[PDB]
Amino acid sequence: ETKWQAFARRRGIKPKTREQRRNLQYNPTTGQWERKWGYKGANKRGETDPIIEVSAAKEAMRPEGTSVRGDKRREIRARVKKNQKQMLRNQRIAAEK
Amino acid sequence: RQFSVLHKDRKQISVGLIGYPNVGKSSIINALRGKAVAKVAPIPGETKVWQYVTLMKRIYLID
């Protein structure tokens, strides 16, 4: 058992259903169906949009060379790096066991 | 107990008692419990409403 599996067994966390974990959601504003993640997913909404609202303070704190169009990809890379470190820790623990 | 073993997947079983008036449904429930838990009278129609009595952990009796 990994760390998440042990924690879920202790806390009584139920596994999500296959219908609940589908990569599909209904966007009301566009009135269309879209993916939550992956190619053209909801996690990258607005990277290809023609106009993006930018906060003045956020743009001032933004480093030179970077733009608003890569912030979501930055957050995805950070989350993927954290998940990868966690799964590597789990694999190392399972290898020791 | 055998019915409870057969329905071990469920949390408990309910056993409802039916019949004519004055046949002894409440008397049977009281006898199974070993205690006067349901009202008993020789006049017909003493029991007017449905009543739950917890016989064991997984056995309920319904008068």
Binding site: - | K11, Q12, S14, Y52, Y60
Partner: protein, 65 residues
């Protein structure tokens, strides 16, 4: 969909129970939960087992389970 079913002998009554106000399908081998642990109430007068199904191609309406 859900209406509050009030229980208790006091003037202030517990309201944890809900009752489904629309028709439901309970399926086969249905035994109701006991009243102490029955939060959702699906009344027997609203349970349906058959429906009038129409085939768009054959233009035939049959009552089906």
């Amino acid at each position: 969909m859900f209406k509050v079913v009030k229980t208790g002998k006091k003037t202030h009554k517990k309201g944890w129970k809900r009752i489904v106000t629309k028709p439901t399908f309970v399926g086969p081998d249905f035994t109701r939960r006991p009243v102490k642990y029955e939060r959702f109430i699906r009344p027997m007068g609203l349970r349906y087992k058959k429906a009038n199904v129409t085939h768009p191609t054959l233009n035939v309406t049959v009552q089906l389970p």
